[PDB]
Amino acid sequence: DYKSITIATEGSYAPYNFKDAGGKLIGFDIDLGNDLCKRMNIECKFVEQAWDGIIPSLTAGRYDAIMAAMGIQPAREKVIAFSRPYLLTPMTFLTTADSPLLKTQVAIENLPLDNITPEQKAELDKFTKIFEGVKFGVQAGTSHEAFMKQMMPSVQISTYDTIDNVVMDLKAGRIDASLASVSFLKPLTDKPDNKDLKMFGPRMTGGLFGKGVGVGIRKEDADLKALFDKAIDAAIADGTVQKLSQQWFGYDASPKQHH
Ligand SMILES: N=C(N)NCCC[C@H](N[C@H](CCC(=O)O)C(=O)O)C(=O)O
Ligand code: NA
Ligand code: NA
């Protein structure tokens, strides 16, 4: 049943995991991680780890789990295991409030990508054509990068160490647009600080975006995955995930029972 675990997080992806005024790690991932460990009867310790290297540091045994807004993504499933999802959110585009990209008609509001029908492909092709000549920025090593490189290869993309640097460059006009989850973009654009930023386009799920946010765990740690899965099911069931989601995101992005 374990006694103590070390959970890695990035600390540059608000409101999932970031730093407070005193430099302490805070956010939905921290609050949920602490709640889950309390249910598992395990001592919880959060450590900071750069996004670039967070998966090989887990497999190298530098810590026991990852809670860092990490999507349960098929490429990642080849390397590590995941808990069942603790948050579910679609992906959408981001630009500035004065951008002509905002006027683009969205033919498909909710776009599931596990299977891409010709109709869905025509919508993706439309946005690809509109974005040719638009400078995109994404955080390196994300499903956002994977989507742009696989689904929109003709679009110029710049990759960044952190999403904070993406946002800085979008505000400065060094890039024209970005891509991230609604769970990241809604709290970002809700801030009065970011009235100059707007979400737009289809809300996409599945495909290379994966099956929701999960706890990253080594494949051989089957018992640790079982403990997390039981704790997450209980935290969803009693409304804890919904409560924390409302607190950090300003809305309910918690998953539903029976999957
Ligand atoms: N900088 C970080 N600590 N994490 C970046 C994670 C970005 C992305 N996941 C987050 C969380 C939502 C999800 O994957 O279902 C997002 O899309 O906003 C991903 O797994 O590459
Ligand atoms: Na990754
Ligand atoms: Na919204």
Ligand code: NA
């Ligand atoms: Na409370």
Ligand code: NA
């Ligand atoms: Na808030």
